[PDB]
Write a protein that binds this ligand. Sequence first.
Ligand SMILES: Cc1cc2nc3c(=O)[nH]c(=O)nc-3n(C[C@H](O)[C@H](O)[C@H](O)COP(=O)(O)OP(=O)(O)OC[C@H]3O[C@@H](n4cnc5c(N)ncnc54)[C@H](O)[C@@H]3O)c2cc1C
Length: 272
Amino acid sequence: VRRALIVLAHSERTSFNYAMKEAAAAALKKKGWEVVESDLYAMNFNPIISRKDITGKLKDPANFQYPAESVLAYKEGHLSPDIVAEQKKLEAADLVIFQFPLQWFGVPAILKGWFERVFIGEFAYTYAAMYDKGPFRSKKAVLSITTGGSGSMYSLQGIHGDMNVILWPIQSGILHFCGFQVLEPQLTYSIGHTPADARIQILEGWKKRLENIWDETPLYFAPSSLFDLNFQAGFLMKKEVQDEEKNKKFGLSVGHHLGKSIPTDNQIKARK
Ligand SMILES: Cc1cc2nc3c(=O)[nH]c(=O)nc-3n(C[C@H](O)[C@H](O)[C@H](O)COP(=O)(O)OP(=O)(O)OC[C@H]3O[C@@H](n4cnc5c(N)ncnc54)[C@H](O)[C@@H]3O)c2cc1C
């Protein structure tokens, strides 16, 4: 605790995203938090992964493979200076806040490129310690999102569909895959159609929550202990666990629906 990192993915300083970023920093600071920032647009961050990310000789210049090359570079300390700087922030951060506007049912290209360049093997993950057993297992991450469409549009009967499915690839595949303890996402719908007074309360509510996030309960994800970790098995659910689940109405999570009903708001509300 005491050390937070806020990754913002918005170009304008007159936007609500910037407003939400400034509100978070203030609240955390008022509580004695060390707030470090990562304003991707202000830093003119480079989102494209390339051989340039490796500041040295490549093991196989003829057949360049980023995964392999980036890992070796990390091991020998030959990573681009801008990548190493972001990694240093993460290592020291206890809480990581991601502030960004929903873009094409996903994360902005500049933020996506941030994950792709900063989350290097051996540093942010390992196929020998996946998910709950990952390197960031002692950290907590929260997604603060803003949207143009209303909440009803992202409801089970909304034209766009369940928001839980949209959040799944990010909160699970990216954040939790690295070990992160994902907390409930702060969702702000149709911010472009909300009255001023209401916008003030949203910021006040955001600050209020940040006063006790560290004490919040994280979302539920199927523990890695329920799977056979090794290819001889295929990283599949343990036979014992499979049988014991046949007599259940709901699945484990959005991705592990197992063909049954998906636990409502599994990626939006905590507890099981
Ligand atoms: C390429 C692209 C793809 C998109 N894809 C999607 C999608 O898939 N799904 C979806 O739902 N939406 C999508 N959107 C819409 C996007 O999510 C919204 O435009 C964005 O979230 C609006 O928030 P904002 O941070 O830009 O703020 P703004 O546009 O500024 O709006 C915030 C409002 O609050 C006012 N304001 C600013 N600061 C403060 C403050 N401190 N206090 C009070 N009021 C304040 C602003 O003047 C404004 O009226 C997309 C947009 C783009 C460009």
